[PDB]
Design a binder for this molecule. Structure first.
Ligand SMILES: O=C(O)c1csc(COc2cccc3cc[nH]c23)n1
Length: 134
C-alpha cells in the first residue's frame, strides 16, 4: 500500500458547480466551454512505482498525464494551454498547480467519503466537481 492508494481506480463525474465560470476565468473560449462543460469525463488514476498516471476520457477530449510527485512537467491541457505543472501530495490532497503566461491555477483532488472531489481555483473563481467510483 502506498502514496495514492485511495485515489486509484476509475471514477465518473456525478456533479459540477461553477465550471463554466472557472473556464471563463482561465480564458477558455465560448465553443470549447460549451462542449467541455457538457462532457461527463471518466477519470482513471493508476500508480506504478513512483509514477502516477491520471487519464480523463470523454467525448470532448481524452487526456493522459504521468508524473512523479514534486517533479515539474510540461502539459498540454484539454483546452490547449501549454502549461508547466507540478503535482504534490499535501496532507492527503493531490495539489496540481499549472503555470503559464504569468498566470496560475490550482486543481485539488480529495477523497471524501466514497467520492473523489475536484476543486479548481483561479483568482477568486472556484469550481467543485464530484466523482463516484465507476
Ligand atoms: O473534473 C476534472 O477532472 C477537471 C477539472 S479541471 C480539469 C483539468 O483541466 C481542464 C479540463 C477540461 C477543460 C478545461 C478547461 C480549463 N481547464 C480544463 N479536470
Amino acid at each position: 500500500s502506498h502514496m495514492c492508494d485511495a485515489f486509484v481506480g476509475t471514477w465518473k463525474l456525478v456533479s459540477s458547480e461553477n465550471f463554466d465560470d472557472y473556464m471563463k476565468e482561465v480564458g477558455v473560449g465560448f465553443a470549447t466551454r460549451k462542449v467541455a462543460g457538457m462532457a461527463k469525463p471518466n477519470m482513471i488514476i493508476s500508480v506504478n512505482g513512483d509514477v502516477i498516471t491520471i487519464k480523463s476520457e470523454s467525448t470532448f477530449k481524452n487526456t493522459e498525464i504521468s508524473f512523479i510527485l514534486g517533479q515539474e512537467f510540461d502539459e498540454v491541457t484539454a483546452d490547449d494551454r501549454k502549461v508547466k505543472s507540478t503535482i504534490t501530495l499535501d496532507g492527503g490532497v493531490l495539489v496540481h498547480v499549472q503555470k503559464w503566461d504569468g498566470k496560475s491555477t490550482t486543481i485539488k483532488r480529495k477523497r471524501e467519503d466514497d467520492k473523489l472531489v475536484v476543486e479548481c481555483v483561479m483568482k477568486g473563481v472556484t469550481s467543485t466537481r464530484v466523482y463516484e467510483r465507476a
